[PDB]
Amino acid sequence: YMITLEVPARDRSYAWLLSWLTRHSTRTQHLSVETSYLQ
Amino acid sequence: YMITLEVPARDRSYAWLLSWLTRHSTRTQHLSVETSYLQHESGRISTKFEFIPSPGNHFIWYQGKWIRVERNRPWESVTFTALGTDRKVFFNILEEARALALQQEEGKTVMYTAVGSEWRTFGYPRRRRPLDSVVLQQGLADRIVKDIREFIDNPKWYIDRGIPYRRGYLLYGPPGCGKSSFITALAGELEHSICLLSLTDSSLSDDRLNHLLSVAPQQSLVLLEDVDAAFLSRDLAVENPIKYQGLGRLTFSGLLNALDGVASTEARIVFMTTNYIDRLDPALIRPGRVDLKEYVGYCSHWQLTQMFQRFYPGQAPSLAENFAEHVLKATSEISPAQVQGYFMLYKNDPMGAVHNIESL
Amino acid sequence: YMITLEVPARDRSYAWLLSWLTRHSTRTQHLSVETSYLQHESGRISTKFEFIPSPGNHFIWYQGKWIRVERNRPWESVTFTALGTDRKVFFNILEEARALALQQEEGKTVMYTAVGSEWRTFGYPRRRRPLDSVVLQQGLADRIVKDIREFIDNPKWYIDRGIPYRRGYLLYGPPGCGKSSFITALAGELEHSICLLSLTDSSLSDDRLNHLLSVAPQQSLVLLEDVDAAFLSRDLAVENPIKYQGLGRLTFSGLLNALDGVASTEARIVFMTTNYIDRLDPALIRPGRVDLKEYVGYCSHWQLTQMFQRFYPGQAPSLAENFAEHVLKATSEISPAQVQGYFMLYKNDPMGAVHNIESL
Numbered sequence: 001y002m003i004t005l006e007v008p009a010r011d012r013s014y015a016w017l018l019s020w021l022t023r024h025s026t027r028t029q030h031l032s033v034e035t036s037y038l039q
Numbered sequence: 040y041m042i043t044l045e046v047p048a049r050d051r052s053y054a055w056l057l058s059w060l061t062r063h064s065t066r067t068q069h070l071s072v073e074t075s076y077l078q079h080e081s082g083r084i085s086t087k088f089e090f091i092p093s094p095g096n097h098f099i100w101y102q103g104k105w106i107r108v109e110r111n112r113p114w115e116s117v118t119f120t121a122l123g124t125d126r127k128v129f130f131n132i133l134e135e136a137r138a139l140a141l142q143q144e145e146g147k148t149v150m151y152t153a154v155g156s157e158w159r160t161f162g163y164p165r166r167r168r169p170l171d172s173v174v175l176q177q178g179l180a181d182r183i184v185k186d187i188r189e190f191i192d193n194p195k196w197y198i199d200r201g202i203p204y205r206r207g208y209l210l211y212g213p214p215g216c217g218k219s220s221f222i223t224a225l226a227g228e229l230e231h232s233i234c235l236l237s238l239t240d241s242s243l244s245d246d247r248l249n250h251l252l253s254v255a256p257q258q259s260l261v262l263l264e265d266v267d268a269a270f271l272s273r274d275l276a277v278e279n280p281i282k283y284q285g286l287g288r289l290t291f292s293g294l295l296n297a298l299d300g301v302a303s304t305e306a307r308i309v310f311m312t313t314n315y316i317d318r319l320d321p322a323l324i325r326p327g328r329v330d331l332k333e334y335v336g337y338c339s340h341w342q343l344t345q346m347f348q349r350f351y352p353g354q355a356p357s358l359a360e361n362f363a364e365h366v367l368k369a370t371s372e373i374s375p376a377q378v379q380g381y382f383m384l385y386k387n388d389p390m391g392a393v394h395n396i397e398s399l
Numbered sequence: 400y401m402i403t404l405e406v407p408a409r410d411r412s413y414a415w416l417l418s419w420l421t422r423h424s425t426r427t428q429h430l431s432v433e434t435s436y437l438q439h440e441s442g443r444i445s446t447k448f449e450f451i452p453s454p455g456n457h458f459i460w461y462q463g464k465w466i467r468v469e470r471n472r473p474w475e476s477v478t479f480t481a482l483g484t485d486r487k488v489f490f491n492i493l494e495e496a497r498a499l500a501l502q503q504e505e506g507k508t509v510m511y512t513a514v515g516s517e518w519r520t521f522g523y524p525r526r527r528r529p530l531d532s533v534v535l536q537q538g539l540a541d542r543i544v545k546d547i548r549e550f551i552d553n554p555k556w557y558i559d560r561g562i563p564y565r566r567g568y569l570l571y572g573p574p575g576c577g578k579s580s581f582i583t584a585l586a587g588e589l590e591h592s593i594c595l596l597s598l599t600d601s602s603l604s605d606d607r608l609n610h611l612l613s614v615a616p617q618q619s620l621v622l623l624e625d626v627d628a629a630f631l632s633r634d635l636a637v638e639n640p641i642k643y644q645g646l647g648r649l650t651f652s653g654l655l656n657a658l659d660g661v662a663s664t665e666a667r668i669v670f671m672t673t674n675y676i677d678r679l680d681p682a683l684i685r686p687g688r689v690d691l692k693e694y695v696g697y698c699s700h701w702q703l704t705q706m707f708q709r710f711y712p713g714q715a716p717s718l719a720e721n722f723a724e725h726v727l728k729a730t731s732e733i734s735p736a737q738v739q740g741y742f743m744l745y746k747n748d749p750m751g752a753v754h755n756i757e758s759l
């Protein structure tokens with residue numbers, strides 16, 4: 001017995017949740033590289 | 040041993056059940072986000088996050104029955120599994136869904152659309168436009184209203200003689216005179232629904248057109264916009280058959296037979312609109328397919344006076360006569376839309392629009 | 400060791416079994432919703448929730464045999480599994496289905512359609528139009544009725560000489576004269592069924608056309624609407640072969656051979672309709688393919704008098720003569736549809752339509 005909120009791709013707050021998730025990336029065993037360059 | 044009611048996507052009460060399910064979203068472990076936003080100012084957007092039940096097996100507690108509802112995932116099939124064999128709770132659910140849905144659609148008009156070969160709703164119900172807000176020529180809206188009401192209220196006379204129970208109207212005129220607005224006002228007045236049909240679609244064929252015209256929702260109007268643009272005719276007709284001139288698998292004979300043929304259904308009202316009356320094939324607008332044809336034109340003295348007294352209520356009657364006289368003296372032909380725009384320039388400024396009438 | 404009768408989708412008694420199954424829906428754990436609506440007024444729509452058996456393994460208790468019926472899910476195959484080897488229950492089920500279905504189709508006409516390469520029903524059975532409600536020229540409906548009856552009642556004479564047992568009729572005239580209405584009335588009178596066929600379909604080929612013409616239901620009519628629009632001809636025929644001029648994998652030679660060739664079937668009646676008699680290739684309307692051709696035209700004195708006495712029963716005969724004289728003096732040609740519309744304007748108002756006859 002839990003709660004499973006489902007937010008698919010077609011949502012207005014999709015970008016907001018993605019930004020928050022990038023903000024809260026600490027304590028995450030799986031990662032993706034976020035390197036940027038400035039010559 | 041249970042009862043498994045199955046309601047697929049192709050159902051009339053599909054929206055009613057969906058609305059009831061959103062109403063009864065409590066006690067549902069699986070959810071979907073239902074947030075909406077209303078901007079006010081200063082970057083302060085109101086949040087309205089709620090819970091649409093997700094397409095899952097949420098257990099409902101309606102009447103203490105532990106009813107299980109499952110929506111699959113493009114093909115959709117809603118399921119209402121219950122216990123034993125009663126069938127009464129299904130009746131109660133359908134009745135409550137009807138009571139909730141019809142309550143929402145009160146004072147509004149529902150707009151349908153053609154998806155595949157079926158009608159589906161298109162957005163939220165729209166606010167209805169008051170009939171008196173649309174000003175046409177003297178004694179024109181009344182005639183159409185009376186004719187439609189007479190057609191609706193006399194089904195027995197049609198059957199007793201054998202004529203098919205059908206009707207059709209055509210509106211033509213210069214661009215910007217009130218065709219679509221009058222159609223919307225009439226649909227609001229008659230408490231009907233509008234079904235939008237496009238003849239230039241890339242997924243329309245004769246069989247699909249016949250099926251759509253056969254399965255149209257009851258208490259509804261079928262609207263065909265710009266029938267001329269879907270079939271070049273006249274000068275072509277003197278040499279070769281009518282070409283379709285567009286993208287789509289449709290033919291002139293198919294449309295002619297679908298509008299009024301052997302397989303045509305009964306109790307249907309169809310509206311057609313065009314800007315070039317002379318570009319329509321005579322066989323398309325013959326009686327039986329289009330019973331009443333009316334012409335909406337440019338402004339007149341009475342129309343301008345009524346528009347002035349509508350946009351600036353409380354003004355003396357002489358101002359309307361002055362405005363009409365000046366407008367008709369300064370210009371000969373003028374569309375009502377231009378008058379509406381000119382009035383929109385002078386918001387809440389009577390006696391100001393009666394001076395700056397230079398719109399040549 | 401049991402008996403597993405298999406009836407796939409392509410069966411004549413498929414509708415009969417479906418109707419019987421909807422009749423015997425009691426004792427069925429799995430269901431499908433069967434609600435229908437009838438609006439009256441004030442947003443009070445009557446509900447008619449019922450139960451179609453869903454495509455499942457519902458156990459039926461016919462004659463205390465625990466018969467199991469399964470319908471799969473677009474390929475469909477209904478199954479009637481039973482116990483032992485008896486075959487009597489199958490015959491009883493088929494007979495009861497025939498008794499129920501033919502009871503429903505009484506006083507109505509069934510309209511078929513071409514789906515793929517097979518005939519399927521198209522909506523509910525339609526009410527038949529009385530023959531006298533359609534008024535044609537003097538001594539025209541009687542001739543066609545007599546010819547069709549003579550063709551039906553004399554199969555022996557055809558066989559004794561080796562002539563193929565086939566017939567075909569063509570109706571041509573100005574738009575709005577009574578072609579489709581007369582066809583419907585004749586089909587109702589003869590207790591036949593109408594099969595609708597379109598030559599401009601996007602899924603029609605010569606082999607499929609031959610198969611459709613070979614498997615047409617018995618006691619039925621085959622209707623071809625607007626055969627001219629499917630093949631431009633005449634002026635083209637003087638230079639190059641007959642092009643098809645449309646969307647579809649069909650050729651002129653294929654249609655010509657299908658209508659009457661080597662593989663053509665027997666005991667078939669075909670009706671064709673057109674508006675331009677001069678746009679048809681002579682080889683298409685030669686005897687053998689079109690045995691009788693008739694022209695339906697504009698109104699005449701007797702036709703107008705009969706129409707008046709039909710729309711306003713109980714009136715004195717002088718009024719019909721007055722109406723006919725005034726109509727024929729005010730205008731030269733007029734279509735019956737226009738007269739019907741003008742009468743529809745003056746509902747239940749005799750002596751009113753005899754005064755406002757200005758319809759030039």
Ligand SMILES: Nc1ncnc2c1ncn2[C@@H]1O[C@H](COP(=O)(O)OP(=O)(O)OP(=O)(O)O)[C@@H](O)[C@H]1O
Pocket residue numbers: 172173174175213214215216217218219220221314375376379
């Ligand atoms: N007779 C009228 N009375 C009031 N407003 C009108 C009238 N005619 C047009 N308008 C207004 O003008 C605008 C366009 O009207 P509408 O779309 O009905 O014109 P139309 O004749 O349908 O034009 P089109 O042929 O381009 O569709 C709307 O704002 C509508 O309210």
Ligand SMILES: Nc1ncnc2c1ncn2[C@@H]1O[C@H](COP(=O)(O)OP(=O)(O)OP(=O)(O)O)[C@@H](O)[C@H]1O
Pocket residue numbers: 202203322326327532533534535573574575576577578579580581674735736739
């Ligand atoms: N002779 C007639 N008697 C009575 N009603 C008629 C007659 N001819 C036409 N009508 C009426 O006129 C309307 C159209 O008739 P119908 O569709 O049969 O004409 P049609 O000749 O087939 O036209 P089209 O060539 O466009 O198909 C219907 O309401 C029909 O009942």
Ligand SMILES: [Mg+2]
Pocket residue numbers: 218219220
């Ligand atoms: Mg418009």
Ligand SMILES: [Mg+2]
Pocket residue numbers: 299300578579580
């Ligand atoms: Mg016709």
